[PDB]
Each structure stands twice: as structure tokens, then as C-alpha cells.
Symmetry: C4
Subunit: 388 residues, 4 copies
């Protein structure tokens, strides 16, 4: 076949419809469902699948004790069929490690997993299910990457990595891969001051990534990548509609080229679709914790430091736990435009529910509609009391 090229724009987003939901924690109460976290979704030309980092144990298994921890030798990137749960028997391992990204270039899939101790981690780049390239840590402090899908154009797939402090200046690099081979890498440029866990999408030969500032910012950094020139810029979302978590209350003036202050040394992976008047931002409803999730239509959020919402949709009630969120699109669907999609990780267990000793999640996913559809809310749906 052929390399996918980003020739289309985004479809007009007037609401969001349910796309996938795996009910993993409900089902895992009485089935062999793997403990996971950091999920995402990624499409092949002939299939869309769920992805996540396994913890190498089932939820009901005794080894689920202690799975609040992020990095171990027992983690792996797995994938499984859309809206099924991640089971021992239906999950496919993509590579071994505790930080990942993955994407299809139209011909084959690239998957990247990072493993190792904090001071000696390394990335292995797989292409067509074979290891092709390796990258050693350059700052010796938890080499880490996107935790959602990358995007490819004409065979070139950019990936954002960070190595260094989670609470001060770090060393972020953008790598450009083709068939798993390193074409080029560059150090981060622009005005973003701290970058983690970028969520990306592609449109009209440009790639846009919305990231997490874990140091001083509660507005989100944005990286804009030209996959042909293999260059990038960075800044923050200018809008005063702040979308990190935890975060201050929304002001009336945002910040384009610096972190908006109030909350230090924390954050959550999130995403946005930045498309002029067709702009939608995702965020937790709570400003204090990872609970609730909503989409807000915020015209020109990227560039207008006074911009406010004109429409919205609740995805997860504030009474229910959320978690990481990220972007993906089916680049191989029919039609003249790409349909914006996203997922929300619904974290259950520790630290917020400490009557159990495990941490896991389920997944809900939505795609955009040109209709103005009615909204529901989409909780994980499991009862903690059943696990006691």
C-alpha cells in the first residue's frame, strides 16, 4: 500500500458521539482482565484498537497490590480490539516498557517503548513488529514519551520525548522517524517552558500536539510540527480557559508564551483540537483532582488570550473519576475531512479509592459529529465494594 498523507482538514465539530467503551473494571471483577493505566486509541488502515501499559497482572490477581507505581519491569504496551477489555487472552504485546507511543504510517505500524531504571532508561523503536532503532537516555532522569498515538505524513512520524526533571527545566527532543529509522532529531524550541505527554493529531500536512506542563503551568503547551520540513514551534494555549489539572480558576486573560501560575509540580495528560472557530478543548471538571470531564468550544483558543466558551458537552460527571485524555483520528476513513476523536482514562483504585490496593482504569472514547447531539455521561461503572 501507500504512506498516508495528511491531505484533509478537520470536520466541523458540533457535538461528540460515543465511539468506544470497554467497561474493563466492571468486567475484571470476575474475568481475567489485565491491570493497566495510560491508555489510548490508534487506528490501522483496516482496524482501530485500544492501547495501554499493562502492569503484568490481572485485577483480581494478588500481584495487583502495589500497581499505583508507574515504572516496573512487568509493564508492556499492549493492544486489543476496540471496546473489548484488555484480557490475558485477547491482548497483543507491542513492546516492553513503561512509557510508549504508537502509530501507523499507512504501510506498517511503529511502536516505541521505554524501559530501564530512572538513570539509565532507553527507547526501543519497533516497525512492522520488529525492533529497528534504539535511543539511550540523554539526561539520565526518566526518559519518557507521549502515552498516546503519534501521527505520520508521507512515512515521516514525529515523536516528542522528554528527559530530565519533572519539576524544573528538562531536555525535550522531537524525533523524526521513517520505517523506524531516525531521520533527524531536534531540541525543543519556542516558548513552552516544560513539556510532557504530548497528544497529537494531523491535518493539512501539519501536526499539532497539546502537552502537559508539569513544572509551573496550568495552561497547556502546544507544539506545532511540520513533518515535511521536519521543524517545529512551541507556545501555550493563549485562552484563559485553563485545561491542566490541578489548576487555578479561569481568569479573563490567559498566557501565550509562559506558564499560567498557581499550581506547581503536577498536571495531567490532556488534549485539544485547535482549528480557529472550530476549536474544542478538553478538561477535567474539578480544578483540584482528576474527576469529571468536559469538552468546551473555545473559538481561537490557541491565539486569543481573551477567548471563552460558547458551547460545551459533559463527558464524565464531576462525581466520577477521570484521568488522562488524548487525541486520535481515523486517517483511513471515508469522506473529505478527518473526524476528531478522543479518549478519557477512567482511573479506579489508588490513590483516591484506597479500600483496594490496586490502581487500574477503563476507557471511554468519543468522536465528533456535525449534528448537535444530546449528551449523556459515561462513568467507569464499577462498584469498589465488590472488590473487597
Amino acid at each position: 500500500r501507500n504512506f498516508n498523507n495528511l491531505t484533509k482538514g478537520l470536520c466541523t465539530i458540533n457535538s461528540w458521539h460515543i465511539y468506544g467503551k470497554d467497561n474493563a473494571v466492571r468486567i475484571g471483577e470476575s474475568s481475567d482482565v489485565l491491570v493497566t493505566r495510560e491508555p489510548y486509541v490508534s487506528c490501522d488502515p483496516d482496524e482501530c484498537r485500544f492501547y495501554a501499559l499493562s502492569q503484568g497482572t490481572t485485577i483480581r490477581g494478588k500481584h495487583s497490590n502495589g500497581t499505583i507505581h508507574d515504572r516496573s519491569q512487568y509493564r508492556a504496551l499492549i493492544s486489543w480490539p476496540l471496546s473489548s477489555p484488555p484480557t490475558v487472552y485477547n491482548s497483543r504485546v507491542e513492546c516492553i516498557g513503561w512509557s510508549s507511543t504508537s502509530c501507523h504510517d499507512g504501510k506498517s505500524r511503529m511502536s516505541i517503548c521505554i524501559s530501564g531504571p530512572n538513570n539509565n532508561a532507553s527507547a526501543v523503536v519497533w516497525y512492522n513488529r520488529r525492533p529497528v532503532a534504539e535511543i539511550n537516555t540523554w539526561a539520565r532522569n526518566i526518559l519518557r514519551t507521549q502515552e498516546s498515538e503519534c501521527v505520520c505524513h508521507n512515512g515521516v512520524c514525529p515523536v516528542v520525548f522528554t528527559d530530565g526533571s519533572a519539576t524544573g527545566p528538562a531536555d525535550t527532543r522531537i524525533y523524526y522517524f521513517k520505517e523506524g529509522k531516525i531521520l533527524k532529531w531536534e531540541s525543543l524550541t519556542g516558548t513552552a517552558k516544560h513539556i510532557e505527554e504530548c497528544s497529537c493529531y494531523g491535518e493539512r500536512t501539519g501536526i499539532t500536539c497539546t502537552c502537559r506542563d508539569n513544572w509551573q503551568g496550568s495552561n497547556r503547551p502546544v507544539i506545532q510540527i511540520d513533518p515535511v520540513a521536519m521543524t517545529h514551534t512551541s507556545q501555550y494555549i493563549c485562552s484563559p480557559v485553563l485545561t491542566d489539572n490541578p489548576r487555578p480558576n479561569d481568569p479573563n486573560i490567559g498566557k501565550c508564551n509562559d506558564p499560567y501560575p498557581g499550581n506547581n509540580n503536577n498536571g495531567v495528560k490532556g488534549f485539544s483540537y485547535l482549528d480557529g472557530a472550530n476549536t474544542w478543548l478538553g478538561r477535567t471538571i474539578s480544578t483540584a483532582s482528576r474527576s469529571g470531564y468536559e469538552m468546551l468550544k473555545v473559538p481561537n483558543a490557541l491565539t486569543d488570550d481573551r477567548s471563552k466558551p460558547i458551547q460545551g458537552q459533559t463527558i464524565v460527571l464531576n462525581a466520577d473519576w477521570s484521568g488522562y485524555s488524548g487525541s486520535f483520528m481515523d486517517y483511513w476513513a471515508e469522506g473529505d475531512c478527518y473526524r476528531a476523536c478522543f479518549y478519557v482514562e477512567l482511573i479506579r483504585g489508588r490513590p483516591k479509592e484506597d479500600k483496594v490496593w490496586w490502581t487500574s482504569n477503563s476507557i471511554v472514547s468519543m468522536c465528533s459529529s456535525t449534528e448537535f447531539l444530546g449528551q449523556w455521561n459515561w462513568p467507569d461503572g464499577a462498584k469498589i465494594e465488590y472488590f473487597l
Copy 2:
């Protein structure tokens, strides 16, 4: 490949033979079998599969408590191989929601799932396993559809939807899809006074649907659809052999253009094959509850308001629980005629068996034979005492 066209008539039906049976509740006593209800069967050109609405839990799982309820965020349309049970590990999710239909047009499969709260539900139309179109509620009162397979002709697949009261006049629409796109919709016309859960089949370029009148009728409404003109008519089955449940005893004169009275605000999904002297009707044996199932040969049942049975076959004894029933056919089989098939849902658990706190079902399915075959009876076969 090519779009299927409805070029054949029905085979002569002289008896029914066993086609499929999944023994799901028996097997689920000690395996990871999903709780379901509203099952059906649908064929692809190369495979026939079972379908149902999952409840997002296994039977032995503690989340099975409360599954008598019809609409939740944890339901999804799943499919799995013919006569296997619906397990966590072998079930494929088609889309998310609590009311569905699905059919193959010869090239790809269309699946439709409705989700949302009662006053804000929406349908998402999937084609070739991608979302293609969306339809918002128009009466804000449980938008709902067939719960068995649709039928396609030359790429055009009609689907019947209802939105509005279950106990008074409602707003029924027939939608005509092609490759998941809306070609046209029309409001219900004809003399049917209330329409729910249509069971359809196709023959000689016409589609016939047998539905449920939940308001005042215990005779079944019939919709006849011309998929080329994209028009329809409606009436009731004229025969005094009444086939809803619950229902009055059979009179000697039926009603062609109005509900036959006696039982209000209830019913069950059912089906018929209306083919002149080759006409067969399905119904529960009990007039009071969903127990037993039988087929009756009732010549010209559609148009003769004096017609009575001349032959029959018991499928499920009155001593055993039944449930929904519906039609399907293998439009891709060999031969000069289409073989009529049907399924019966065998409901176990609540409300009729309240020693357990769950509701689920298994499936039995039959197809027609030109032979005069001996009959058996086909119970679910599970013992409730084992689940206590």
C-alpha cells in the same frame, strides 16, 4: 464484491430444523459469559453470527445484580460465532448503546446503536466498522429501533425507528441508508397505530417487517417496504390467530386496520413469514407471560381475517421461559430460494425467577425445511439452584 439484491422468493416451509443454540446460561454458570438480552442472528456473505446487547458484566460477576434494567452506559451491541456463548474473550463489540440493529449489504456491514438518557438519546450509524452518520432524538422519549437484523437491497438498507410514548401515539420513522449515509427518511404511514421492535426479512425486491404494538394491540402491526422506491405501507396481521404477548384468547375474526383489544401497554418482539399459503406465524404458547414458543402455519394470515392454523410446530414447551423472537435469513446461501430462519430468546432470571438478582438469556435458532421433520423442544437448560 457486489451489493446483494433480493431476487429470490421464500422456500416452501413444511417444518423447522435446529440451526443454532448457544447454551449460554448453562455454560456461564462456570465460565466468563457476558450477561445479555435482546439477541438476534445476522449473516455476512462468509459467516453467520449471534448478536445481542451486553450488560457489561459476566453472569457470575457481582455487577450482574440489577441487570433486569434495560438502559445503561454499560451496554453494547456485541457479536460472536454461531452457537458459541457470548464470552468476554470471543465477543466483538459493534457499537455502544442499548438499542440496536445490524445488517450486511453484500459489501460491508452496517450497525446502528442508540445511547443516551431518555430525553436526549442518539443513534450512531456504523458502516464497515467506522462511524458514518448520527441521528438525534426527535421526540425526546427513548429513541429506539428493531433489536434484530435489517435487510438490504442494492445497497439500500431500511431501518424502522420509534421515538415517543410506549403507551400512546408515538413518532415512528423509516430511514433508508446506503453505506451508512442517510438517503431519506419518512414518517410512518398506513393503519398501524403503534410500532416497536420490527422483525424484517426480504424477498423478491420487497421487505416485510412484523412489529410490536405496545399500546392497545395484541395483533401485530406489519410494515411493507419497497427499498427501490423507498416507500412503505402499514397495517396489522388480519388473522384471528393473535401473536403478541400478553394477549386475549383467539377470536374468529381478526383486525386488519386497528389494534385487537384486551391487553394494554405491553407486548413482546416477535415475527412472522407472510407468504400467501406458505405463511407461518410465531408466538408464545402462554397468553399471559413469555413462556413457550410455537410456529403455526396460517394460510394468508396477512389478508384473511378468518384464517386459522393448518399445521404447527412446538419450539419451546410452555413449561420453559421464552422471550423476544425475530427473523433472519442467509441471503448468500446456495439455491433458488431464501430459507426462512428465526431465533427465540430464552430469558432466565428476573422478573420470573427472582431467587437470583440478574437477568440474562440464551438463544435457540431454527431454519425452514421442505421436509416434514419430527419436532423436539429446546429449553435454555440451566438450573437456577446452581446459581444460588
Copy 3:
């Protein structure tokens, strides 16, 4: 592709080597393994699979209680990959019923399942996984068939059926199918006096079946079928090496055209390879019960009523339970000859082990070698005490 034709002879049989073994009862002690009985093996052009009649429950499931019974609505013909156990999650249902046969003609597979009450049973013939023909009971007394694979030549697949008494004269028919359609049937001719559960193989355009005389005989009946003329003959194995079970001790003169007396109203499915000086017979070691299994090389056993063994191989020790046995061959293997194969059913549970309330089996299978290989013995290997 093309219809297989029987153009080769049997390979020289100098010993037997292990082919497959599924350890089903061992594994089912702690996994979701279906209760089965009446297993066999059958090859497709690209795969060989195990087959059996499921009982619609797992071994550890509470519905395993009572599975000594042979005929129920919860039985089905299933198949699963060679040497795996029959699990809920890996088994494919071929058709519904409690007596079966199945074979591949080179293009597609035909499967036949019989279901119904004792006085009203019927066979459904499936071809390319669709129902094609049906056959009603003709003697109203447990219509029944081979319980191992049929054999095809140039698209024509003969199958032996019996309807009527298990303890007196019955009505046996040979049906000739092509693409699931009935070409012809004939009533049994020749000198066999009672026929059940034929085990067949094909070579040089002839099909040979070794059957079970359940009435008066402890020598086995043989049916020889010409699939081109669609005619047959029948007799008994002439050898005094008797191979039914239970049976008298071996005399020095056998019987060619009548039952050898001593044991009435019982038997077991078995097989032989009748090939002049290359003749091998299978039998239980015990004359009283289904325990042990051995192969004996008995030159001209079919026609020589004085013939005795000149070589042998123990398959299952007399200290271990056996059961049904039958023939199959890979008609699509490389080489100038067909390699003779067989399976032995290893029955565990009731009636011989009544500390449990279930009956199931595992499978061992062997194929012939031109080498003189060392022998092992191949028990089921499960410990009944573990199931208590």
C-alpha cells in the same frame, strides 16, 4: 480448489507414532474445558482438528452432573485445534445434536448432526457451514450415524446411518452426498447383521468402514463402499482375533458372514485398517470393559478365518480407561501413499469412576510409521481425587 480423489494406497505400517493428545481432563480440572464424549479427528486441506460432541457445560461447572446421558438438547458437534483441549473459548460449533459425522471433500466441509426425541429424530446436513439438506427418522428409534469422519471421493461422500433397535434387527442406510445434497441412498446389503458407528477410511477409489455389531456379534462388521458406482457390500472381519468390547476370548476360527456369539446387546465403536498383509486391528485389552488399547498386525484379517497376530503395539495400558476409537487420514499430505491414523477416546468419570457425577474424555491419536518405533503408553493422566 478441486475435489480430493482417492488415488493412493496405504503406507506400509510397521509401527505407530504419537500424533496428538489433548490432556483435556487434566487441564479441565482448573480451566474452562467443555464436557465431551464421542470424539474424533478430521483433516481439512490446510489443517487437522479435533471433533467431539459437547454436553453444553464445563467439567467444573455444576451442570456436569448427569453427563453420563447420551442425548440431550444441550449437545453439539464442536471442533478445535489439534491437541488443544476443547474450551469454551476456542471451540467452534459445527451443528447441533447428539450424533454426528463430518468430512472435507477438498473444496468444503460437510457436517451432519442428528437431534430430536427417540421417536422423532432428524439429521441436518451442513455444507460450507450452511444447512443444505434434512433427513427424517425412518424407523422412529434413535436415528444415529458414525461418530467419526466420513470420506469423500470426487465430491461424493458416503455416510452410514442406522435407525431402529440397538438389540435386534435395525434399518441401516448408506447415503451418498455431494455438496450436502442427497444423490442417492440404499438399504444395507450383504451379511452384516447389525451396524452401528462405522469408522471409515479411503484408498485407491474405495472406502472401507469397520463398524459395531451391538446385537449378537463380537466380531466387527465391515462395509466396503464404491463411491463412484455408489454401491456397497458388507460382511464381518473373518479373523478369530475379536475386536469388539465386551467380547469372548479369541477362538481359532472366526466368522465371515455372521456374528461371533458370547456377548449380546453391547459393543464399542472401533476401527481397523484392512490391507492384505498390511492389516492392523485395534481393540481394547480387556475383554470385559473399556480399558486398555492395543494394535495388532493380523495379515488378511478380513478374509482369513484362521488369521492371528504377528506383531503388535500397546497404546493404552489395561490399567487405564479407554473408550471409542476410530480411523482418519490426512488425504492432503505429501507423498505417494496415505498414512493410516487413529484416535482413542479416554473416558473418565461415570460409570467406572462414580466418585464424580460427570462423564467426559480426553483424546490420544496416532499415525503409522514405516520405521519400527519404540512404544510408550498414553493414559488420560488426570487424578479423580482432585475433582472431589
Copy 4:
């Protein structure tokens, strides 16, 4: 397709990166994971898979009691997807027996399994998933083979077998197969004095095998095979870096043509990559038991009896249990060189952990990198206390 030919050399090995890990014992604490031992890895042109000898029971099953034993009728060679665990539901049986090897020749896979009692064992050779040839024991004392993958060149696949004493001179043969047929065999020649469990790889039309001397040696024997001439030589690794287990401490002079003494009648399967200055040896860290695992870069280890390490990498800490290790490569990967890979068996249970009554393992696997990557350590990760 075409037979693979060994046209490439080894890639430069500057470090090792994680390739696969199945966490089988962790996951098997609460899932239907088969008990195994003697694992390995082998690639097809389109897939790489894990292999092992099953014990015909799950870990949590009661039949796991006694699985320290090596040879039983319930063992089989199974394969399953890379980095998944070996489950009842995802494992494919290749053949039946208790000693094995397997390899793909570019067109189809050959698998060999040995079964039988100690004095009457036999090998069955499968090709394209059909039995093709058989080999009877020639010394009547546990006929046995490699327990890791063989290597093919232009359709010819050499395999090393041993029959005879484990504690004195034995009869080793090299067999040369093509499409499962025996082309030739030869008796072992050269200076190796005892050969078991060879680990092989291929490069530039030569095959190199590193074996186990179980009699008097703690240096490893090496067999070098010319698959075109179908001839071989043998010797020992000359280096004083000793790599058997148990073993003496490293001297300063090794032995090229005789066993290095100190430890009798024991050993462990292991491997090396012998490639001049690109030479790397694997070994346990402990000299006394199967604990820890490390790679050492030992230039010209094969031929230099003074050679010492100049670089290394720890794979498994000495505090953690290891086991067998072996070589494999993806002969169908892209690039101008073959990437060296290996696996380490991580044995859990008896004899070292006798609070449980079973013996099983998990797998870790690495491949070489031209980068100098940071190292981690890779334990099995299961807690024995959870199994009590």
C-alpha cells in the same frame, strides 16, 4: 516463497535491549496459564513466537504438583504470541513429547518432538504441520535434542541429537533435514567429549552451536556446521571465562580440546555468539546454582585460551533465579546484518523454592544494539507467598 539463505553477518553488538518478556508466573497466579519449562523463541517470516514444553496442566491446577519431573506423557511443544503468557486458550500445540526443536526454512516450519520411555524413545519430525519422518532411539537411553531453535540454509536444517549417558560418553548425531525428510546423518566428530542441548545461530552460510557438556566439563562445547557440505567440526570454547553452571572459578588459561574440570555430571543449557572481536558469552552469575544472568564481551573467546571480558551487561541479578538460555535470530528482518538475540528461562518453584509443589518458568528475551544502552535487570517478578 523461497528458502532463506544465510547471506548476512552478525550486526556489531555494543549492548542488549529488551525484546520480549511474558510475566507468565505473575499472570498465572490468577489466570489459566500452562506450566512449562525449557522455553525458547523462534521466528517465522511474518511473526516471532515463544515456544516451550508444556506439562499439561495450569499452575493453579492441582496437577501442577510434581512438575519438577522432566518426562511424562502429558508434555508437548507449544507456541504462543511473543510476550504473551502460555495460556490454555492462546497456545498452539506443535507436537507431543518432552524434548524438542523447531525452525522455519523460509517456506514452512519444521518441528521435532521426542517421546517415549527412557529405553524406547523416538523422534517425530513435522513439516508444514504434518508428520513426515520418524527416528528411533539408537542407544536406548533418553534420546534428546536441542530445546531451542534450529537454523536452516537453502532448505537444509541441521539438528543435533544425543542418545546415551548423561554422565559418561554418549552417542551424538547431527541430522540434516529438508522438508522434514532425512538427507543425511553423521556421528559427532572433533574434540567435544559430551554434547547436550545445543543453542544455534546462522551467519554467512555457516551454523554455530554452543552446547552443554554434562559429563566432566564446565567450558562449553561448540559445534560448527556447514549446511551446504553437510559436515561439521567440534571443540570447546577456549576462553578461561567459563560459562556452564555449576562451574569452577575462572582460571587464566582455558581449554580448547577437552573439558575444563571441577564439576561433574551437571550443567545448564546456554549459548554464545562467536564472532572474533564481536564475541559475546552468556552465563549465570552464580557459579553454584542457576541464579543471575550476565553477558560478557570476550574477544576471540572461541580460539584464544587467555581471553578475558572487556565489557558486560547484567540481565538478571544474582538475587533472582535464572535457568536455561539460548540463541535465536530474526532471519527475515530488514537490514544488511542479522541481529543477535537470546532468551533466559526464569525458573520458579522446585527445587529452589519448595514451599510450592510445582516447577514452572517465565521468559525474558533480548536483542543486540549498535548503541551503548543503559542496562536494567529483569526478574520473573512473581511472589511465591501468593501461591501458598
